[PDB]
């Protein structure tokens, strides 16, 4: 009876043999682990060391030869992991692992370059080394999650649900990780001075989803994601579920349909989604619920057979309060389930997370007739790390993606990220006329220094050396600049790329410790991006911009 | 055909394609020994090559680069074998080896600590490394030494024969080798100046048994256990077996019961033990053999079916002689066979050594009646390396394990090891009015010197620092000192100690280079221990006494 | 369905249970090497940069720490794929790649050993490692090629193709690697001053086979191997093939027989063989084929039922001509079929490589009647690296085997190579009054010095101290000179030693910097080495002589 998991499809499972052999290089990568995370362990005895008394000779040697052992065993093992042939989907997860824990040393030995080495600036080749490493654990994890996708979409009668299932676990396991591998260039994000083990903030702003569907399912997956997923859009805020029932009998009472209330990124305005679902005749709204606190889990309940007929939803908010769907259904019909979905940090409540340990808030709701009165629901989830202020910090880099803006012209548009940015990107286009223009807006922290000042960087790819006009708006008052980009990469057709790799991501910065933002504190701070006169052919796409405050550090390094 | 060993039971058996993968992974742990073996051979080719020319700076550096090297290795293989989940029982012994290795090479390192590194005095690291492994290791092998131990006990139907060959089998190969870590710490246990490769010579004083039991048994293996071994007590040479045969009818004489005669460590006594078996009408005594020499080979023969009917034991004495126990049945019975006991270096002969290559020597026969006329006959035996005469050696630092004593009084009794110790300990109580009292005889070497100053140490574990009177008599003459045992553990309800730790055995010195005993040579030295006037809850178990030949070394050290 | 590779007889493959582990071996081996791959590049990142700045003690650090790493990893491997029990033969291709590798990196070691240490000619212990390294590598490939021979050898009505598959397979996979490390050594073979890669070439002299045999054979190994394959000889040159046709019935025109003409190494004669197969009544030679280029490729056409009923051969020439056979069987039976045979460097095209990527060239066919009209054919190929002209290289050690003689006297005979040195060897004996001679014709190079020096070396095998005449004619006058041999190795009765080791194979350097060869530019010379008054029991073994252009270089080491 051998172990399967949700991602060793690619291997060979029709048979017991080739399970047990399975299970067994499962067991083996586990140990490799463990042998990783000792030599980890051993490099961080030795580092804490070190640290408490610098000068010593013998702790300067003992960490530097602890780092050459242990960097060397965490590649060997990143290698191994992605170089076991019929494994590499198998292997994926723990590879990331890997491949994290390798970077984030390498990390270490950059910040340290300096002290350990005795002609030091030594550590050019160790950063040739970790941008050769970020882009192979990129290309690699990024290569093999769209194969075992792939596999999955064009499998005969393939289930969507399985289909999703896989999407929403590699994001988590891998996707997300691989988001973190920008911030952990020492260069680009110099180290807190004060704890080195402290990182620019990354956020994820994907949605994942789960979804109440009937099994088996005979709607394609195609049907099925266009159906229950949303297209590319800006960040989004659940503010409002509204839900229609099928009221004509009584004793059939269902969800019908369901409309969303939802708000961009610090914008007073409350936007309305079209209606799912079935509003005809018969078919009424009778709830209107207002989420003022954020959903970290939910439940529905529906008659089994036959099946998604749905009678209740529950919504658990973190202010520890309850709101809820009720079709009214009278009298309650036979054979009644209900399902839990939400995330949690502990592997023993999987869909079940309490308001101490989840990891998502809801963030959508969509509803997919399947025949009368029976409906597919999907709940869509955002990472609970995406900060709802757009604020930035006093003390380190802030990252604001370029989706959590709130404002975007006709020729500004989100596009599909590329599966290791965290999310998707905004595309800055040019009709000939006019070009696209993005805004977000930003809060500043607290502070008493009249007015502090910032960098503003931009982290993009382009097509070719374009123009940009960037400003900030403060009280009213505007500010601009201008910067041209790089040309970052280039495309057949100049079709808006798909793929973009991560070497084809650059970094701009239109406000520096020159001529930096001059912000105030606690107040509403307006961004905005937008090329100067731009050709048709011409692309712009933002990942995030980024706020540095500008302290001596800074400056220098400047 | 998948080959079966005997600490497979926790592994999936029940299937050719389990064993199949389970035969791989022995394959693959002895591919890795072997790996760790030639880089063991590196090292020692190295730091041969250094010591020849200590001041050569290539060899001294060569010789610390493959140390880190080697020791890196190893700690990452007993990593591997201990994190290899559903194979930590099977992978015991060879996990056990590779630990032994780890530390005599981490000893290694500390011993050269200064000499290799620049700034001296750099072993403090290793040597909290070392005590951490050491730590580690032992737990690792106890808490699965136990594990595979209550399976087997729990076993419905249980056999007492697997259990016990399981115990013996585990001594032999995980135990015994726990029981040398002590003797490791070279802060402890200083490095012979000649050749560093000398240890204090470690002691197993624990006994194994080999039995004839009836195949299968319905005795429970509670009911074997306590009627073929024997309970705790000081350790005992075999000095004298008396057998009793069933002499109503001459065609059915068998065994029918036995008795021990023994001695205690350095005793002119000769001790009694009860009879075993059954002694009553129509059994005699008909046998008093004495055990001048020791016995390192023995074979019982018996009938077949019914099996267990004895009539002869044969006892291989290593004065190359024999001695026997016959029934003298007559006429001969059909359907004997001959079992041997024993144990040999020498893979080849499992059950018979020759007297060139035995490791253990006979301590007791139990017999226990199954039915009239057949009996499981038990053997016990002590490792070969137990010194009769409690020797102390003029060059190293002797041990002599607290069970070898030979007088204990009324609140003084022998307890079960945890495991890791090489046999029992002797606890040192008080009923409110008597404490704890251990005297053990040792013999002095020969040597020319008038007296020779020796220091005394206790290795023990203690539950409240504890007063402690500690003398040594010498020609009729008595000198003693007092000294304060440390808290080293605790337990609720101050319930006798089943299980202590590696950590909770500490070291006090009553004798030392400040004031030592002075020995003269070839005497007999009584060496005594009890606390003074302890409460009723206080505690003081004793692993072993330490004699340390007061040098120069040792007085500047002190 | 587990895959099936030609060298894994000696694992169970008797169930798919055995099969399927089997292929997991492999797969874990291919992971396994793919990080010795990784580890060898860090290494050579590292070598490059120091390399280009040697002063930069971050650099030299830096690969000095990476040498030491990749080292501990390939060796390591080199263990590991040698010692995991019932895996040896599976794994001796993969084995033979990594010691290859293995010892490689030593030789970089040693060229900078000087460089990299303070204390230079830190070399000494490096090189004893290498040469231990050289032998046990060597001798665990030929156990264990000659384990797996033994046991085709002797299979149950073995099958000769198998038999003959596996020689050629193990010969190009491991045989000719083991070949290139007496190469290695870089006190032997100083490294070129400009590019250390390159190395004194080594040539394989030995003959793999191809053959169409009819299937299934009741002829036995040894009968097929004596009828198809060739006895020790001098390399020979293919220079014509002559070819028997059965020509009594026109509709019954097959191939009946064949003849070689060839030549020894720049002799000027035509040597011609006896002739293979039956030549008799109604068998009448019908086909005399010059091969004035080398053949890359053959092709041979028979019919199926009966099978080996020859009418066509094809021979593509690497001049871009096809020569061929064609027995003019009128009219064309039915059921003809046509099989390639050739070697590339190409897997996807095994036995049709193309001009560009061949790796041999056809040096012999020997025809063996199964029946009248049915004939087995063989044809024996030599690898391409084998220079014809036996070429002294100007700016490199010139290794020319003593099988590439064009002479030998009746004492001089060639014997089986042990498997190690790339070939044969030739043996110089002594029946009492005459001593064996071989003479070998090198040309020279085409320069403009008046003359240039060169040493000559001999890598040679003998039982004893033993004169040696040497000498070398240029423009019909003679310089001689004579050396004795140490003696390298000892076999009972003096038998003519078959299995010759590594280290039975030492160096005398007749002619050297003091008294060096003065060779003119493009000219034939003469070299010969025979034995001065030897015993009837004395040997001396010559693998090959070497030329040395005596350089600056050469003359101060010397
Ligand atoms: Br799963
Ligand atoms: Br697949
Ligand atoms: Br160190
Ligand atoms: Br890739
Ligand atoms: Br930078
Ligand atoms: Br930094
Ligand atoms: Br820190
Ligand atoms: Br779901
Ligand atoms: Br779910
Ligand atoms: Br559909
Ligand atoms: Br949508
Ligand atoms: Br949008
Ligand atoms: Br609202
Ligand atoms: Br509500
Ligand atoms: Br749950
Ligand atoms: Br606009
Ligand atoms: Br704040
Ligand atoms: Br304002
Ligand atoms: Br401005
Ligand atoms: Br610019
Ligand atoms: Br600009
Ligand atoms: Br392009
Ligand atoms: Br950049
Ligand atoms: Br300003
Ligand atoms: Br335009
Ligand atoms: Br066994
Ligand atoms: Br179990
Ligand atoms: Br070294
Ligand atoms: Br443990
Ligand atoms: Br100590
Ligand atoms: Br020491
Ligand atoms: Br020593
Ligand atoms: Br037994
Ligand atoms: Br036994
Ligand atoms: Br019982
Ligand atoms: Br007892
Ligand atoms: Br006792
Ligand atoms: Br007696
Ligand atoms: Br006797
Ligand atoms: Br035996
Ligand atoms: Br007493
Ligand atoms: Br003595
Ligand atoms: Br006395
Ligand atoms: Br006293
Ligand atoms: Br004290
Ligand atoms: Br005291
Ligand atoms: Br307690
Ligand atoms: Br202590
Ligand atoms: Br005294
Ligand atoms: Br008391
Ligand atoms: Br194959
Ligand atoms: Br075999
Ligand atoms: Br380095
Ligand atoms: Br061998
Ligand atoms: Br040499
Ligand atoms: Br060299
Ligand atoms: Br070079
Ligand atoms: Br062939
Ligand atoms: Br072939
Ligand atoms: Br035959
Ligand atoms: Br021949
Ligand atoms: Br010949
Ligand atoms: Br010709
Ligand atoms: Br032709
Ligand atoms: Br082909
Ligand atoms: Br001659
Ligand atoms: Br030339
Ligand atoms: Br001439
Ligand atoms: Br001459
Ligand atoms: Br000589
Ligand atoms: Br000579
Ligand atoms: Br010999
Ligand atoms: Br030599
Ligand atoms: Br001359
Ligand atoms: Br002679």
New interface residues.
């Given amino acids: 009876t051998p172990e399967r998991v949700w991602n060793d499809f690619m291997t060979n499972t029709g048979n017991?043999?080739?399970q047990?052999?399975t299970a067994?290089?499962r067991?083996?990568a586990?140990?490799?682990m463990?042998?990783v995370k000792?030599?980890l362990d051993?490099y961080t005895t030795?580092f804490n060391?070190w640290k408490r008394e610098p000068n010593?000779?013998?702790?300067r040697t003992?960490v530097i030869?602890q780092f050459?052992?242990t960097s060397?065993?965490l590649?060997?093992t990143a290698?191994?992991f992605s170089?076991?042939?019929?494994?590499e989907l198998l292997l994926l997860p723990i590879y990331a692992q890997v491949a994290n824990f390798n970077l984030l040393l390498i990390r270490d030995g950059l910040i340290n370059a300096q002290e350990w080495?005795?002609?030091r600036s030594?550590g050019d080749?160790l950063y040739n080394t970790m941008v050769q490493y970020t882009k192979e654990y990129i290309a690699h994890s990024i290569t093999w999650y769209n194969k075992g996708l792939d596999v999955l979409r064009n499998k005969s009668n393939g289930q969507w649900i399985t289909f999703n299932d896989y999407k929403r676990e590699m994001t988590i396991q891998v996707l997300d990780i691989l988001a973190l591998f920008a911030s952990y260039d020492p260069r680009r994000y110099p180290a807190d001075k004060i704890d080195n083990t402290k990182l620019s903030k990354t956020e994820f702003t994907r949605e994942i989803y789960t979804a109440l569907v009937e099994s088996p399912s005979s709607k394609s997956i195609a049907a099925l994601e266009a159906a229950l997923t949303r297209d590319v859009h800006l960040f989004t805020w659940l503010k409002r579920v509204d839900f229609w029932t099928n009221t004509i009998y009584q004793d059939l009472r269902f969800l019908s349909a369901n409309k969303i209330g939802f708000s961009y990124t610090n914008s007073s305005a409350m936007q309305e989604s079209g209606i799912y679902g079935s509003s005809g005749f018969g078919s009424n709204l009778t709830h209107q619920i207002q989420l003022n606190s954020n959903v970290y889990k939910t439940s529905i309940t529906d008659t089994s057979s036959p099946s998604n007929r749905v009678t209740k939803m529950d919504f658990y908010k973190i202010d520890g309060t309850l709101a809820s769907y009720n079709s009214n259904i009278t009298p309650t019909p036979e054979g009644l389930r209900t399902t839990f979905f939400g995330f949690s940090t502990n592997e023993n409540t999987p869909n079940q997370p309490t308001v101490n340990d989840y990891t998502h808030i809801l963030s959508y709701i969509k509803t997919d007739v399947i025949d009368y009165n029976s409906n597919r629901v999907s709940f869509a989830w955002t990472h609970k790390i995406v900060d709802p202020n757009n604020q930035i910090y006093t003390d380190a880099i802030t990252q604001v993606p370029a989706v959590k803006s709130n404002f975007l012209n006709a020729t500004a548009k989100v596009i599909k990220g590329p599966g290791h940015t965290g999310g998707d990107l905004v595309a800055l286009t040019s009709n000939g006329t006019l070009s696209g223009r993005m805004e977000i807006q930003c809060k500043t922290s607290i502070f008493n220094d009249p007015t502090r000042s910032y960098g503003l960087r931009i982290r993009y790819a382009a097509n070719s050396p374009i123009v940009l006009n960037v400003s900030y708006v403060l009280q009213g008052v505007s500010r601009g600049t201008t910067i041209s980009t790089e040309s970052t990469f280039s495309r057949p057709n100049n079709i808006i790329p798909t793929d973009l790799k991560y070497e084809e991501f650059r970094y701009k910065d239109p406000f520096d410790a020159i001529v930096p933002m001059r912000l105030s504190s606690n107040q509403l701070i307006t961004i905005a991006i937008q090329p100067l006169n731009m050709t048709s052919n011409n692309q712009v796409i933002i990942d995030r911009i980024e706020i540095i405050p500008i302290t001596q550090s800074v400056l220098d390094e400047t």
């Fill in positions: 017991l043999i080739d047990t052999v067994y290089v067991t083996d586990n140990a490799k463990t042998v000792d030599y051993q030795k060391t010593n000779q013998s702790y003992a030869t050459n052992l060397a065993k590649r060997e290698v191994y170089n076991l042939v019929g494994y080495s005795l002609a030594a080749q």
